[PDB]
């Protein structure tokens, strides 16, 4: 099932960095990683809980489409892109929490808790607020958990409509050319030590899918990128991508 | 509603070519192009046929989903990457025609007739063979009309469920980026001699859609990249792509 490939290493440590990624090979069930033991440890998801979050609210009809506008509340945050109105597309796009803190107090925290254990998501632990508990309460989840829960909404398997699983992996959209489509979530976790960066999804390729995983240790703001340029290393050193 | 701008034809003589862009603002409801009597020609549509094949063929069960293959039947065609298994997905990248074809033949005449009615697709008329009207055939289309197709179905406006239209946008993604996404498809009608290349779809933005249909004479298939390439210089004459 899994693999550990040491080599994957030198794509952090000349990054000046620390971490894990975690890929899974549809077609062939077998699994890799450069750390099993990272894989394995369960961080707070931060904002890729949006994506079950997303699933949540559009099973309930809290989000009633991919267009719905959800305006700005005219309090001016420290991320440019969040002060302005938003849809489901954009707001997973700019990771725009205020959004999805919304969302959270309209889905409550009974239907929450009762849906995540339904989604077999990580520790399916809500505590803490209903509007933050993925960025600071009890909610934990691992690179493999992430994983196991990606593919069985990529097989559309999730306890939820089948419509509302297609809109989200359609909000997941990150990257498409004629070589490959990147459907992925990223996530900055700030409030507990130590700071993780997370990008979690899949690649799509003409006849194979790649899960993927990965956090990494993330003291400040400035090396976020490093989430998708590491994980296109490791990417292309697979030959997954050109 | 519509309004002329000649401007663009310095694309189309800068490539030593001649054809038609049409672009649409939803935001705006508001028509633009550089030809609009040629605009308003219908054409043969080739392989833009294949939105509405694909979305008759979901609704009516010939198509289960987007993960059904369709397996290559071992005639060596002259477009290499029609000699292998498809999905729905590479069916619609790589233009496979003999697998919508087969599609056509389980739909059948008298359902083709009635789904193209209800979805007011062109002049409705398929004449000619059940398999190849589309190419050699009756029916007809112009660029106008495919975007009033084209904006039913990014509404999910048609007379098929809301999967089957869900199913096809997803197949029609072509490009994707931080900057837009580019949901399309393209054409390339050979058998009538005015040959034209089709490139019909829509870019989608943060706050806005831009539909768009182009054709262009097409003498042989070198050419054919010209398609995407003046449709983007137009994008990016308008800025609505960077
Ligand atoms: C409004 C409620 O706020 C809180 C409530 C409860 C707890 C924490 C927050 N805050 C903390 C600050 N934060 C933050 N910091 C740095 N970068 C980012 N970013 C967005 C996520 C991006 C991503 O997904 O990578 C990276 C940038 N976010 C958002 C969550
Ligand atoms: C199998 C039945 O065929 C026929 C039956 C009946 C009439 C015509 C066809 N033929 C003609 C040859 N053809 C063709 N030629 C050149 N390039 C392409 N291409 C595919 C479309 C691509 C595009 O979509 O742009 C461009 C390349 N296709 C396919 C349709
Ligand atoms: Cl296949
Ligand atoms: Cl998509």
Request: net charge neutral.
């Amino acid at each position: 099932m899994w693999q550990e490939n040491k080599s994957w290493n030198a794509h952090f440590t000349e990054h000046k960095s620390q971490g894990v990624v975690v890929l899974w090979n549809e077609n062939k069930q077998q699994g890799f990683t450069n750390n099993l033991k990272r894989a394995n440890q369960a961080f707070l998801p931060a904002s890729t809980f949006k994506i079950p979050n997303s699933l949540i609210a559009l099973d309930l009809g809290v989000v009633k489409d991919e267009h719905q506008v959800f305006k700005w509340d005219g309090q001016t945050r420290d991320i440019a892109t969040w002060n302005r109105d938003h849809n489901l597309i954009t707001a997973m796009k700019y990771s725009v929490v205020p959004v999805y803190q919304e969302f959270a107090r309209q889905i409550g925290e009974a239907r929450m808790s009762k849906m995540l254990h339904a989604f077999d998501y990580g520790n399916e632990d809500i505590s803490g607020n209903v509007d933050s508990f993925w960025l600071d309460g009890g909610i934990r989840i691992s690179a493999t958990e992430q994983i196991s829960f990606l593919r069985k909404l990529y097989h559309n398997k999730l306890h939820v409509s089948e419509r509302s699983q297609r809109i989200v992996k359609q909000a997941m959209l990150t990257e498409a050319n004629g070589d490959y489509i990147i459907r992925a979530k990223t996530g900055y976790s700030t409030r507990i030590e130590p700071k993780i960066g997370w990008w979690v999804g899949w690649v799509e390729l003409d006849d194979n899918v790649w899960f993927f995983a990965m956090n990494m240790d993330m003291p400040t703001s400035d090396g976020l990128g490093l989430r998708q340029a590491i994980t296109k290393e490791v990417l292309k050193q697979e030959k997954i991508i050109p």
